[PDB]
Design a protein around this ligand. Structure first.
Ligand SMILES: CN[C@@H]1[C@@H](O)[C@@H](O[C@@H]2[C@@H](O)[C@H](O[C@H]3O[C@H]([C@@H](C)O)[C@@H](O)[C@H](O)[C@H]3N)[C@@H](N)C[C@H]2N)OC[C@]1(C)O
Ligand SMILES: CN[C@@H]1[C@@H](O)[C@@H](O[C@@H]2[C@@H](O)[C@H](O[C@H]3O[C@H]([C@@H](C)O)[C@@H](O)[C@H](O)[C@H]3N)[C@@H](N)C[C@H]2N)OC[C@]1(C)O
Lengths: 143, 129, 150
RNA sequence: AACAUGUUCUU
RNA sequence: GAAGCUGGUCAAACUUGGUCAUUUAGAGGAAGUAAAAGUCGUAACAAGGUUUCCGUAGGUGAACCUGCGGAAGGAUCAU
RNA sequence: AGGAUAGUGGCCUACCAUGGUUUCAACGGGUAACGGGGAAUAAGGGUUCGAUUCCGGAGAGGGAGCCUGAGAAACGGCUACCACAUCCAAGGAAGGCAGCAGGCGCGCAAAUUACCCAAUCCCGACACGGGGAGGUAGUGACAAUAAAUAACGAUACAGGUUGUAAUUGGAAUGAGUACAAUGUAAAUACCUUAACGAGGAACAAUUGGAGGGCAAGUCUGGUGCCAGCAGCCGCGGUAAUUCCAGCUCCAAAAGCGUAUAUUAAAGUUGUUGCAGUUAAAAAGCUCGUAGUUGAACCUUGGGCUUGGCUGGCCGGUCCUGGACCCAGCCGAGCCUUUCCUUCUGGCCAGGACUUUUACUUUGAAAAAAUUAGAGUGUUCAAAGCAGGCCUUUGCUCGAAUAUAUUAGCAUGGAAUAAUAGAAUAGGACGUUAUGGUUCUAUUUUGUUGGUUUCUAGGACCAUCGUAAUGAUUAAUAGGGACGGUCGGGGGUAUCAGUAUUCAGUUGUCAGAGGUGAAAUUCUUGGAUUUACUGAAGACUAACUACUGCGAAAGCAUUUACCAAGGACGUUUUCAUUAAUCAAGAACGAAAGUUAGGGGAUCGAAGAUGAUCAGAUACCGUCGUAGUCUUAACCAUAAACUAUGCCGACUAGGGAUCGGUUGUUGUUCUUUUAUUGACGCAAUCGGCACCUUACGAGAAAUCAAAGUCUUUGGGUUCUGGGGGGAGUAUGGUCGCAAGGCUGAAACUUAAAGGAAUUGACGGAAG
RNA sequence: GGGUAAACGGCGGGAGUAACUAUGACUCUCUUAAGGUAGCCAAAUGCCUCGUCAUCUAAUUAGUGACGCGCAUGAAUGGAU
RNA sequence: GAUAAGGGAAGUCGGCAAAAUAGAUCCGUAACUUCGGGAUAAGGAUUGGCUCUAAGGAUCGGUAACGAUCAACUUAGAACUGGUACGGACAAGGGGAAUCUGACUGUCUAAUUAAAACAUAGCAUUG
């Protein structure tokens, strides 16, 4: 009973059966396929720097109605084009075309956050200084 | 097909016990089954039992006294070293003060407390409490 | 049960408890042995010899009265068949089915049954080889099987 | 016999 | 007894060809997903107004329609 | 067989043979792979990490080749090529930081071109020289330990003996600056310390939060689904506890937040320990190899003598002490038909033999560091391996112990699970059986070397003799035979039946057909209707069922033939031959494909009449393929019981099909038997059903979907949120249609199951 | 009066319409025996035309791949391979 | 009828004409495919002379697994050797990637057209 072999000499069957079925586990399969290394925008890092290509406003999903302030960015390390998001009311005005921003994920591990369609990264710094300080004026943007 | 006569014997004992029966028939018999029943009977979990000769594998009638909560086999008969008896006792028995893991050792079929007295270990065979 | 079916029949012979001949049996072991030899030479398989002994000679079992089973006695007198009887009957059934099949090519159920019969032939022959009853290279073949039962 | 449709978002 | 000479041996490296792998341009083509309030009909949910669905085969702006066999997850556990 | 090597070896050569590895996964491919000691998390079992303080390997831009030397295929040695790269008077010359420090680049990502041989040890001809090895400083919120940002009194106050809300004072202090010594190679810093060093003790603590999860506000302004917040659910549309701000509060605090990865939570990878009727998920169905797993049985009992340590009785008490009785546990030895090797010297030590394994016991040994852990006022602690003593010219306990063990080695045991044995006897014993044939060895009559039968010790052959001479049951496993049956199981011939369409022969006359209603259509050239007769293909009504058979798909007129099959019966036969099964095979509705044949009927496509807003739909009328058959293909269905197969057990009831066994107030042969039907009981097998719910379950429900946290009878397959997608790509099968195998990017907070109340229904009452 | 296209052969116009624009899945209308289906294409068949885009070259009225309201492609006058 | 420095189709409507390749042995050979092919695909190496070595037979005569006698030209390998020659004359394919077109082999305009034209097997229709 139970549909798994119980024999004392059945170890190979059990080990290989477990090995086959872990592929259905998304975390294990991502790790052993090397998806973060070969297909992620950041190449598997926590942070990445880039150059701003434009500004874009994205209409939020239902049931909200707003315009999220996001930038189109091309990363230094691999030239990939990603859309990042700038927090904190009054900070799209701190970023300009051909500025160098430092990015990070939203904390949902490569997924979108909140009502923002198709955006996976958040801007951390611009021109070498953090948005948190520029918002609170602890520092000013060097140009 | 029949793969464990001891499993069938102990299953029949449990199914008779839970229904309030005071007796149960067993078929086939074996030496291992008789030794397991003798260990059970020594600790008071069953009454007497009688072997019925049929010029075949045999039959057994067992007397039940209502003190049995559960008996059962462990299949496979895992090899147990001495220091691994404790994990089997923790896993299988209701409490530390009663119940038995039944072992087959080169010294014979015994409960785990007798095994601890003689400092012997073998394969795990079953349990009773 | 039923290796090659889903039937669960239990019909069988129930062998009696006592292992001795009954008090009303008077024939000797020699009479029964020479009777077995007489019927064997006459062209009967051990099963059919046992049937005749039971049906007309008061012989409940050859073992109880003679100390030996029919095939063992039969081997000891150079009369054991070159192929065991059950294998021979399986082969004979396969031969008949295959003759019918060559005469009736659209009988798909007979083709299925032929597969079953030949699988049993192969399993039984494997057993007989592994206990040195058949030669190690013994191997059933459909083309040549008409020569054994011949 | 016929009978299609009902802007978005809540409290 | 130096340079040099003969024949071997190990063999860098270059050219050509072959093969393997990994990135990548591309007219055009065909998908998928996302995105408050565009168009067309109304296929499904009630017998959803032709019960629905499966396999297969044709047809059609679109949902879909039709044939043959199957299922009830049916709208009948029943005369 | 040689050559070469320091030496073995296809290391290389010559000749020769055709071998070696593999589903127990070879070979090939990937590795964001140096291995290990170890690290993180940790109920247990596990999961993840280990470039990096120690050990082993490898490399010095890439490759190769060498010199020297005991030792290098060395790079702070050479030689050459490739790639880089410095100087040049243009002829030439010189290089290798993955040593230390430092630069460029790269990037999310990492420090000074500092001092010194004083410790650690290393090298050399060496007590002395050298050591960027190493040690000391600089940078250093990687981590870890300890730990300031305050405290104490009094006035009227406040309050039920202090716990009190403010402002009045006396004090205390190290953060820091700095006399001096110490520390040190010299320093620095710590430790010690002159003069200094706090009332807003401004010597002023931060990071995140205050709807829920989750601790802490419905206070005031601003905005007005905008701007923004929000891990998730959500907040925000003019009274926002959620945004932007001010006040108060909460949490941790010299640290707090974010991002990524991983661990627990996750019994959401499940061996322990998941799920598969309907939520994802039992292969359409059997056969079958590898794998996994497989019934029972062979020394059991009995008695005697005796060692130890457990409790109490002696009790004898200083926690503990001795002979005796009692019992309990771990043991030994003898005897019972008796295993437990066998000789020599003569309870050990040299010979002659040993059926193989798994499992378990014990032990030898197994680097430090790390882990667990005993000793130590590093002032505590993290640590370290020290330290403490009457104060000496000394004395001193230490530097514990376990953990390691998959594999190997040695060892006790003989349960469990295997393996071998004596069946054409080619079997076992004969000690000092008997005879024959061979070998070797000590020993001579000591002077050398001999004869070769006794002889000692192997090895065989023959005879003879001992003996209880030697074969386990037959499994409510399985296979086979046999007997009477039973089936709408299969195949081939054959034979009915009406109906449908059509054709001929008649007869009458005005419509027929079709629908909700019609129209298309057919009709005085006679439609439809009626009778008789014929011809074609299909199909097999009623009987027909909670009935039968088959592996499933499926299978229904009669008769004959052909070969199979279950169940039953059996005091027949063989003896484990078995269960389930990757790979691999047979069959597989309908539709579809190819080639012949047939083509009545229905009828995809198409045509056409209606309907309709439009219907290339439903409804009407035609009608091609198809529908049928023979040869081949195709391999799929809600191929369903959405429920793998084998095995055991657990509760009541009436029916039914097949076999068998005992038995009539019954009908009937024939008046009665061995007629038959029916009736009454038992039984094995089967298709099912009803009740219950002990039990199971989320429920619906379930006699299995029970015997499952009290979690283990055997075994195969499948699933792991929803999509993308059974898609793309590669492979493979197919004539094609397609079948099989089968991703990823990306996207998303639910999708889904069962039930409840309402509402609704061109549903019913 | 009926049948017959693997007989000869044949196989349509005009207007309007989507929350930038454009386009037109959708609608109205006239009309045939039927209104060119599946495919294929500037092709040995396309006038305009050396069509437009891509590729090939230093440069291409050439070549090839695409696109298709195609003067005048197209199914045994056989279509596509 | 020959040869030609350097270039190599710039010539020309167009590589016309010429050149280049070529035997044999060994190696290696893609797409596509009607599974038969494509294929000599593509692309490489070798080849003389001399002196040797080995293999492959026939007939007689009793472990004959042997001797005796006879006999044919094939194959493979090694040493040496030369102005690096050697299928030395002769003889003797250039190859690849695609488009249009006819399936293929076959046939016709003797005396300007050999083709995509005709035929063909296969397919359909008619009497
Ligand atoms: C491309 N995705 C694959 C998926 O196809 C599947 O792979 C299976 C693989 O598990 C099977 O193979 C597996 O199981 C066999 C077993 C039979 O012994 C093992 O021998 C084998 O090593 C093991 N990888 C293989 N036979 C077929 C693949 N499609 O599961 C693994 C995967 C990586 O997710
Ligand atoms: C349910 N079937 C739908 C079909 O009805 C149609 O729906 C459209 C929908 O796509 C449009 O909506 C779409 O386009 C609008 C905008 C760009 O116009 C977007 O804002 C919106 O997010 C997007 N879903 C909506 N505005 C009208 C529906 N009928 O869209 C295709 C479809 C998926 O097959």
């Amino acid at each position: 009973g139970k549909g798994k072999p119980r024999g004392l000499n059945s170890a190979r069957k059990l080990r290989v059966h477990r090995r086959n079925n872990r592929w259905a586990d998304q975390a294990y399969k991502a790790r052993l396929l090397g998806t973060a290394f070969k297909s992620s925008p950041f190449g598997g890092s926590s942070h990445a720097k880039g150059i701003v290509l434009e500004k874009i406003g994205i209409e939020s999903k239902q049931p909200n109605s707003a315009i999220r302030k996001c930038v189109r960015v091309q990363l230094i390390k691999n030239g990939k084009k990603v859309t990042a998001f700038v927090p904190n009311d009054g900070c799209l005005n701190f970023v300009d075309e051909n500025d160098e921003v430092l990015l990070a994920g939203f904390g949902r591990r490569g997924k979108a956050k909140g009502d923002i369609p198709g955006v996976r990264f958040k801007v951390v710094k611009v021109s070498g200084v953090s948005l948190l300080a520029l918002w609170k004026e602890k520092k000013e943007k060097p140009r | 097909t029949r793969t464990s006569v001891l499993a069938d014997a102990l299953n029949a004992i449990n199914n008779a016990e839970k229904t309030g029966k005071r007796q149960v028939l067993i078929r086939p018999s074996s030496k291992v089954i008789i030794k397991f029943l003798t260990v059970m009977q020594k600790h008071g979990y069953i009454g007497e039992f009688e072997y019925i000769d049929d010029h075949r594998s045999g039959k057994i009638v067992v007397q039940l006294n209502g003190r049995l909560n559960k008996c059962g086999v462990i299949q496979p008969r895992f090899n147990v070293k001495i220091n691994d008896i404790e994990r089997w006792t923790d896993n299988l028995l209701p409490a530390r003060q009663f119940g038995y893991v039944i072992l087959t050792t080169s010294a014979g079929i015994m409960d785990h407390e007798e095994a601890r007295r003689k400092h012997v270990s073998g394969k795990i065979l079953g349990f009773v409490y | 049960g039923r290796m090659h079916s889903s039937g669960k029949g239990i019909s069988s012979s129930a062998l009696p408890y006592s292992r001795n001949a009954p008090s009303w049996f008077k024939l000797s072991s020699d009479d029964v042995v020479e009777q077995i030899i007489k019927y064997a030479r006459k062209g009967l398989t051990p099963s059919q010899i046992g049937v005749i002994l039971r049906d007309a000679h008061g012989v409940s079992q050859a073992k109880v009265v003679t100390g030996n089973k029919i095939l063992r006695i039969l081997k000891s007198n150079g009369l054991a068949p070159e192929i065991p009887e059950d294998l021979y009957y399986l082969i004979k059934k396969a031969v008949s089915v295959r003759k019918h099949l060559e005469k009736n090519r659209k009988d798909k159920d007979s083709k299925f049954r032929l597969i079953l019969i030949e699988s049993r032939i192969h399993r039984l022959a494997r057993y007989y080889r592994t206990v040195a009853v058949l030669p190690p290279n013994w191997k059933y073949e459909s083309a040549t099987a008409s020569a054994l039962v011949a």
